Amino acid sequence: KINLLDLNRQQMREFFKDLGEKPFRADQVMKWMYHYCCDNFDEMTDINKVLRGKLKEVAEIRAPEVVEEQRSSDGTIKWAIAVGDQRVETVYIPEDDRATLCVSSQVGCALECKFCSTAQQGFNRNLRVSEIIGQVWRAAKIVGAAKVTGQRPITNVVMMGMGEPLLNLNNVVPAMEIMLDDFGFGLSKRRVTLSTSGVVPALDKLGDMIDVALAISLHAPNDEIRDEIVPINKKYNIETFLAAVRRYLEKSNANQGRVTIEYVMLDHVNDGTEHAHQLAELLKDTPCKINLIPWNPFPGAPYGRSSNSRIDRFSKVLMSYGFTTIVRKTRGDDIDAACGQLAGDVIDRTKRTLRKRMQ
Ligand SMILES: C[S@@+](CC[C@H](N)C(=O)[O-])C[C@H]1O[C@@H](n2cnc3c(N)ncnc32)[C@H](O)[C@@H]1O
Ligand code: SF4
DSSP, rough: OGGGOOOOOOHHHHHHTTTTTTHHHHHHHHHHHHHHHOOGGGGTTTTTTTHHHHHHHHOOOOOOOOEEEOOOSSSOOOEEEEEEEEEEEEEEEEOSEEEEEEOOOOOSSSOTTTTGGGGGTTTEEEEOOOHHHHHHHHHHHHHHHHHHHHSSSEEEEEEEEOOGGGGGGHHHHHHHHHOOTTTTOOOOOGGGGESSSSSSHHHHHHHHHOOOEEEEEEEOOSSHHHHHHHGGGTSOOOHHOOOOHHHHHOOOTTTTOOOEEEEEEBTTTSSHHHHHHHHHTTTSOOOEEEEEEOOOOOOOOOOBBBOOOHHHHHHHHHHHHTEEEEEEEOOOTSOSSSSSSSOOOOOOHHHHHHEEEHH
């Protein structure tokens, strides 16, 4: 059966055309899928029985299942999500004015950022469209579908879970298209963010395919530091990355002219005032908003968390040059908030097989 969660609107329409149906019936089913979080054709009461029959035979709505759920006292929900025989992470971060979902792009990552827990697993495989948009679908279903509760469960999506999104463009783009779609999650392009450590030619490609808000994982003020911290910089250095960012801003207006810059704060590595002065000079040619992120520790990482006084002085230096800078709040502090940790060791895979036999 075809998983309808693999298809954007164009493809949904083409599939329904092959079923002998008019294109607007695809729109109607999408609306059921995403506005109501319906995965059951019998529940789609305004579709005729004949179409329901076709769909039950040749199609399905199969979203990844939750295998673990952690609920923070601050409202954050962290899910381990089953994708085949593997696990990825999806995180729901509520606020009064907002609700952000952090979504994974790959099982593991091949980029080897030393401060990232997902790096130490390595790269396993790319997620399919259904496995990416399906995280939004599952989260929406659990939190409460928009037309069920009368409130949009998710106002904001960030591709900031496990994996490098620019290395899964084939699947990440259609998934984001569904997020943007009126018949999908109806999100504004300003409210869908793709974060990247800087796969430069893939970023040039992204710009030709879709217009979404861009965030860059910079984490260093110069090349010698960034080579160490984020090793893809050895392939495409800061200047190459920043030039690509400028080219993207020419094609896209989701950022409203200003790229989001992510900067993780690693104790006595990239968090000094001397690093802040260098960063300020580095970014003089690129319009931006700077997010300083306290590093989230995990066992065996060769870094420490920067103290809040060191982070605050770093921020003051940046603000003295007139940069819009924001120190991000730690969310879900009472739970396993470090990216990649809840979908931990891949060796537990065999143990899961054995577990299911006893069930
Ligand atoms: C997990 S990555 C996924 C998207 C893309 N690969 C990237 O690096 O931007 C999303 C963001 O999480 C950050 N990150 C990873 N591990 C972290 C940790 N332990 N503490 C704080 N931030 C972390 C990275 O710096 C990156 O900006
Ligand atoms: S920070 Fe991003 S690019 Fe680096 S290893 Fe983690 S998921 Fe991959």
